[PDB]
């Protein structure tokens, strides 16, 4: 906190800027726990206050119910609220939120198969398509295509995509079968 105050009030000093990097780990550990607000001080000047935020306060502040309460409060202030009542309604909301967070802190004391089936269907149905590649006996196809014809390249070029489409159909059917087996 002393280092943060010195850094934010001496923003162009290089000796402090070559000394702050010597405390990055400490200044990174306390970043979540370091509070920082701004007030109009007793000297008629804007002053910056540094305080401590505990982990329980942040955990209860980041709860879904408190966030929804904050959204509703902000909506109400913006729409149905004025400007002279803003900092009064804000304190009234902060007090209720603090009491709720403090009560929650004390009271709080101490699909997968569906994805797996689809993944297995992909694996199996793609290995079925890849086994004809992993044959090494396509030398017979090579021998009959060796008499080159653009017609036969057209035919085989269409046949590869037809095989891909058939593999996709098999994969879809396997997924449907697995879904029937896992719904019940």
């Amino acid at each position: 906190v002393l280092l943060t105050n010195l850094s934010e009030h001496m923003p162009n000093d290089t000796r402090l800027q070559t000394f702050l990097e010597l405390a990055e780990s400490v200044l990174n550990y306390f970043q979540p726990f370091l509070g920082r607000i701004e007030i109009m001080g007793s000297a008629k000047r804007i002053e910056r206050v540094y305080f401590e935020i505990s982990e329980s306060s942040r955990t209860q502040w980041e709860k879904p119910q408190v966030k929804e309460s904050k959204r509703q409060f902000i909506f109400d202030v913006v729409n149905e609220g004025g400007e002279k009542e803003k900092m009064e309604l804000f304190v009234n909301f902060c007090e209720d939120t603090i009491f709720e967070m403090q009560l929650a802190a004390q009271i709080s004391e101490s699909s997968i198969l569906t994805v797996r089936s689809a993944l297995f269907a992909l694996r199996y149905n793609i290995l079925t398509l890849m086994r004809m590649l992993s044959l090494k006996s396509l030398k017979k196809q090579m021998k009959k295509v060796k008499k080159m014809t653009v017609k036969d390249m057209v035919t085989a070029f269409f046949s590869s995509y037809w095989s891909i489409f058939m593999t996709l159909l098999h994969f879809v059917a396997s997924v449907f079968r697995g879904f029937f087996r896992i719904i019940c």
Binding site: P11, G35, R36, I37, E38, I39, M40, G41, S42, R45, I46, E47, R48, V49, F51, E52, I53, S57, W61, I74, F75, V78, N79, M87, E88, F90, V91, C94, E95, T97, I98, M101
Partner: protein, 96 residues
Amino acid sequence: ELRDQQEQVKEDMETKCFICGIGNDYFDTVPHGFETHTLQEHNLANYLFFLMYLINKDETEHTGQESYVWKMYQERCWEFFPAGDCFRKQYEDQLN
């Protein structure tokens, strides 16, 4: 009507700070200036956290600034809330 009401809240929160009321035009003279102001300087959650700290802190253990804020809170005067002013505007010539 319920759509315009929800859009107005978003517009106000994206174009004006909740606490000070200064527009984003002033703060966006430095990159991500409005984000820095509304998440580090004038965060509305930080003011709630400060009030919690002040309330849960012993009265004989406040600093002078904390005692000043505590007295104004106890007599319900909200002039310790920056309104139209901030650090980077008060010290604009020094900071920049």
